[PDB]
Design a protein around this nucleic acid. Sequence first.
RNA 1: UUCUGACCUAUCAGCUUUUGAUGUUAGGGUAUUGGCCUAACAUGGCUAUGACGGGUAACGGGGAAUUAGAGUUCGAUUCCGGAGAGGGAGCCUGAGAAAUAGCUACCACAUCUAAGGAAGGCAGCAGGCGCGUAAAUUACCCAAUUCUAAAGAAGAGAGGUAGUGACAAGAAAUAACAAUGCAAGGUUUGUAUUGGAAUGGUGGGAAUUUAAAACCUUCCCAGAGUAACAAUUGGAGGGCAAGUCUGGUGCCAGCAGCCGCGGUAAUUCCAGCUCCAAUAGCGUAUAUUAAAAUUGUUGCAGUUAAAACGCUCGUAGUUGA
Lengths: 185, 43, 60, 144
Amino acid sequence: PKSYRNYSKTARNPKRPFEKERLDQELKLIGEYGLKNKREIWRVQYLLAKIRSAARYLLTLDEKSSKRIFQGEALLRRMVRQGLLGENEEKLDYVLGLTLPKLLERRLQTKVFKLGLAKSVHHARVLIRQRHIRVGKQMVDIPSFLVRVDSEKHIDFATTSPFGGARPGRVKRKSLKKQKEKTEA
Amino acid sequence: GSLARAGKVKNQTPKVPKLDKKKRLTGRAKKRQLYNRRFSDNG
Amino acid sequence: TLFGGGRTKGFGLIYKNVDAVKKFEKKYRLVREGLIDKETKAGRRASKELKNRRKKVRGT
Amino acid sequence: GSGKPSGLRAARKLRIRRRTQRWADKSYKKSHLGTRWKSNPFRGSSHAKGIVVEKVAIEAKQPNSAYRKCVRVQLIKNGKKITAFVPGDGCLNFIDENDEVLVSGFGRSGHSVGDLPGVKFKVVKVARVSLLALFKEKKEKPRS
RNA sequence: UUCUGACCUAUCAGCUUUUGAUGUUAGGGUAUUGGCCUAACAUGGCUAUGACGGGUAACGGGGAAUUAGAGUUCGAUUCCGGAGAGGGAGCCUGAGAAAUAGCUACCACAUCUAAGGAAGGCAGCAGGCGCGUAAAUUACCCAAUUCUAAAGAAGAGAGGUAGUGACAAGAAAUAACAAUGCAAGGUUUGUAUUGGAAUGGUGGGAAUUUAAAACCUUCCCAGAGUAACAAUUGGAGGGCAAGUCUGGUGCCAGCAGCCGCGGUAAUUCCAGCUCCAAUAGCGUAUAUUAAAAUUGUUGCAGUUAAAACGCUCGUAGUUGA
């Protein structure tokens, strides 16, 4: 038999791929948020579209329906946990209200830049890829990691990194500098 | 027939090397560089 | 030992005595601990000599 | 209705008229008639192996006059002669008189293409070496 | 065994009944109902709400794709049910098989033979051949999952684990940074020279992981400056995001889904340069959906563009204050 493990596509490019306005806005999104691909925007678009579809299903359904109140409460709880919704944002028109910069803002590279751990989003991306961050004492190398609302206070540099002072990373080079200086002196 | 003139232009035309050039920027770095290059002031 | 180290998750068993280990443990875990040789194993050459034999041609 | 019955019991009529009238479309006729599998040599494949019969220089249609270098190929699998395009100028020269060719469709699914009369097909590998690779950077191993 | 549910076809309109067709009666057979089988007696039975044939690149279903809503295309193929084990046929064994790593015969194949005779069935798993445009290793193991026994401890190409794997899917490099130099902005932001930190791939040892081995992770050694530890594909007249850029060719060569460019001062060819799009993926073809309110229930069109039967009655049909 075949593996019963699932798999799913994360992206698509809408028809008219040379839509000028769409292209220019996406380029500005890449530039601003330190993305590597249009595919990064497309995954965020898929998440937003999933949100829009859910929100449409909820708002089309009436008040006092079991599916509607269960799914709506569950979605709002989850969106609050992800940190998409504000304090009094607890109604379906705010779920529709969500925008692509806000989803991008939940990314770890954006947060690392925001906290001032790195001096740029792209710098933050490389900092994260080079294994120097920790979230709640867990190292993560993923720049597209989406930070939960509770998690935001718990983001710092890895204690097992050279930045965390455990050892220099280039022991060889640091040793060479010490050895050469001691030999000459 | 009239099969005489096949392959003409490529063989006729001068052919020159490209000349060496340093490796290009790519990815996020290239897109960032393009985003700065394009969007400030035209001239 | 998990991503980024410093914590390690596994699974453990502690038997009452050695008598419990000998009675109610099986070969691969003992082999992993130290035990030597899985006895009388040679694959399908066994099957081949067996299916050749019918009514005591040879005792093998 | 107008030109259609409304009728509650008229589902029968709607089905039969739809069933009869569907056949008028050309694409539908090609898709559901057997002729597809018969007259077409490739018959549900993109690709087929053939041998070159003739190297021909077919003249392009009147406003676009040229002599376009093509190869008439006999498919090995179904035995049928077809005309196939050779992309790239020096590639007709590259192609052998008795060449063993991998030929495909030319993008129009058995309709004729561009200014080329009689051409529905293109050779895309010769001697099972890529034709495009030879045209490109003179790349994959020639005449092994 | 009841009921209800199907793709295409009228250039297939009458079919079925010697010969069980359809009913009844009597038997026989079967594990049992049963024209299942025989005798006797009726002369029926089925058919436009398309029978009877013929076609299917037709196993059936759960389902797959695209879906605003209808729909349309697709369902060998991970579960279920059926069929089949070269073709038919016939048996034996047994609770269960008309079994096919059961048997027998015939036909179709086909092996060893000392040529007297003998034995045979990969659409099980590998692997090979042929076919082709087209598809992996004669690997290791029963540790898990289950099955078979005199059932714990043995067996199992069931099943697992690897190997081969750009089928598909997710994640993710190809630097970051500070100086100077340069650019614009009032002392800021943006960006050719240098020079210290950080990092995996790559090579090794362990801890570990394991049926065992390999991968993963962890630790320790090694270990980038042109970080040569080297990103590609296809385009840049319009459709359509990018050049009235440089030479050469001169309706030739050729390109180009399409419109078109080329016949001598080529923005379309051949190179070169720059620019642009997507990106470890991107072309190309064939198949198929959207697109297509271009098959139209929703939702088409029929004065002149395609289309009101020459005309009227009329059974089926649909509609009926």
